[PDB]
Amino acid sequence: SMKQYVARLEKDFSLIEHGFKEEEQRALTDYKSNDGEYIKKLAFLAYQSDVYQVRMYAVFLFGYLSKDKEILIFMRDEVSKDNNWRVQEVLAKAFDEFCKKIGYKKALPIIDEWLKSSNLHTRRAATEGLRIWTNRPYFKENPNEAIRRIADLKEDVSEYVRKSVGNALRDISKKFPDLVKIELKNWKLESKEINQVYKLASKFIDA
Ligand SMILES: [Cl-]
Ligand code: NA
């Protein structure tokens, strides 16, 4: 039964102290081996586990299932409430999986929606999940479309978000240093928040 399978996952995954590949691989196999109706039921049951590793497994399933708007909304609104930081990392990966499946250019309205969400975890999942942004389709040929979107969050009230924003710009600066330099030149570094983001973003820029 489904309940018995979740119990097995709890026994097996609770031993895993680091990483995410074991949970990811199992989620992928299960997603590919069963019809969507079944796997959606399993993902919701697994996500209620008190074992965070099993919730990680469930959020990978959500990512594979995320063409279903109901699943994507649950990711946006409910998984974003998870108190476990490792689950939050998987949320970022599952969002990236959504974007990859529908296509990054086609995903832009959703990316913009998540970046403007009220939940800081929703904003961070988008910023972090797409790193390195300019390695992704669309953004790799249009790097300012990534830089501008990330830089919009440079005054975010959340330090969690700001660290992701600064790091995401930092990523891009390693392959497009002039474009990041050009973006940063306009910043008025007056707040504690923007200076934190600037310090992360500008490490490899000859400003
Ligand atoms: Cl990457
Ligand atoms: Na990553």
Numbering used by the authors: 0 to 206
What does the paper say about this structure?
The HEAT-like repeat (HLR) DNA glycosylases exist in all domains of life and are structurally and mechanistically distinct from their base-flipping counterparts. Here, we describe a new family of proteins related to the HLR DNA glycosylases that lacks DNA binding specificity as well as alkylpurine excision activity. We identified a fifth family, which we designate AlkD2, not present in B. cereus but spread across phylogenetically diverse bacteria, commonly in species which also possess AlkD.
Crystallographic analysis revealed that Streptococcus mutans AlkD2 is structurally similar to AlkD but lacks the DNA penetrating B-helix. We developed improved crystallization conditions that provided electron density for the missing parts of the search model, permitting a more complete and detailed structural analysis. In SmAlkD2, the N-terminal capping motif lacks helix B, and helices A and C are instead connected by a short loop. The loss of helix B is accompanied by a ~10 Å translation of helix C toward helix E. The positions of the corresponding residues in the sequence alignment suggest that helix C is also rotated by 180° about its longitudinal axis. These spatial differences would eliminate or alter interactions between helix C of BcAlkD and DNA. Of the five DNA binding residues located in the ABC motif of BcAlkD, only one is appropriately positioned to interact with DNA in the A−C motif of SmAlkD2. The position of a bound phosphate ion in the SmAlkD2 structure, however, suggests that SmAlkD2 may interact with DNA through two residues, His17 and Arg85, not shared with BcAlkD. Interestingly, SmAlkD2 retains a largely positively charged concave surface despite its low sequence similarity to AlkD. Conversely, SmAlkD2 failed to increase the amounts of 3mA and 7mG relative to a buffer-only control. In contrast, SmAlkD2 bound G•T-DNA with the same low-micromolar affinity as G•C-DNA and bound THF•C-DNA only 20-fold more tightly.
